[PDB]
Amino acid sequence: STQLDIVIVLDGSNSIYPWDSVTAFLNDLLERMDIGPKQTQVGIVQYGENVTHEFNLNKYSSTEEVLVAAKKIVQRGGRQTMTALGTDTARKEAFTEARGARRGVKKVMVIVTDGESHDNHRLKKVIQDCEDENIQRFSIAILGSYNRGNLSTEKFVEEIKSIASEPTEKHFFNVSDEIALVTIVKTLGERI
């Protein structure tokens, strides 16, 4: 039966606004989980230019504690968007026994971003490494800032889709804007 190690990878770019929309997403997604050492564990990493572990997989042992922490996460911002670095760091550091990962438990990564990555040339390798380590990946593309800035989103969407596990349609979410993020909580939760 179930058991789950979930690491949410958050793009802290300034373009994402309002930040309340992201924390609302975290709250609504996480409150529907049974969090504990013998159940689901959640770890959160935020990236911009560099990466920060907001908290490890075994930092909190109850849904209640996680919800309190999730709300405290502040937007770190950043010039460049290093999604490959964020994902790779999550694989290499977040999903390790030292930080709480559990032997034999299913691994799930949830990536939320609102732009193409400056280190997109690393994605091919980074994604394959996650795949070899059996990390199911759900990727979320927020088209808000791009649309508000009249930027074509075609390539952006293609890039974020490439991060999602197959079948893509089930692991990739095209979110029109920040305020619409909480809208996918029900579905994402049913698929994780």
Neighbour count for residue 45 (Cβ, 10 Å): 23
Give the single-character DSSP code of 186. Answer: H
- Based on the shown chain and the rule CB under 8 A, indicate whether residue 58 belongs to the binding site for a second copy: no
Nearest to 83 by CA among 179, 186, 12: 12
- Based on the shown chain and the rule CB under 8 A, indicate whether residue 182 belongs to the binding site for a second copy: no
Nearest to 100 by CA among 38, 189, 163: 38
- Based on the shown chain and the rule CB under 8 A, indicate whether residue 103 belongs to the binding site for a second copy: yes
- Based on the shown chain and the rule CB under 8 A, indicate whether residue 136 belongs to the binding site for a second copy: no
- Based on the shown chain and the rule CB under 8 A, indicate whether residue 98 belongs to the binding site for a second copy: no
Nearer CB in complex with a second copy: 105/151? 105
Q: Which does 114 bind (CB under 5 to 8 A by kind): a second copy, Mg ion, none?
A: Mg ion
- Based on the shown chain and the rule CB under 8 A, indicate whether residue 21 belongs to the binding site for a second copy: no
Question: From the list 79, 98, 104, 167, which residue makes contact with a second copy (rule: CB under 8 A)?
Answer: 104
Q: Which does 169 bind (CB under 5 to 8 A by kind): Mg ion, a second copy, none?
A: none
Q: From the DSSP assignment, how many helices (H) and strands (E) are in the chain?
A: 8, 6
Please tell me the distance from the alpha carbon of residue 124 to that of residue 191, in angstroms, as a whole number.
Answer: 24
Query: Residues binding a second copy: what is the number (CB under 8 A)?
Result: 10
Nearest to 60 by CA among 46, 45, 70: 70
Residues that bind a second copy (CB under 8 A): 1, 31-34, 63, 103-104, 189-190
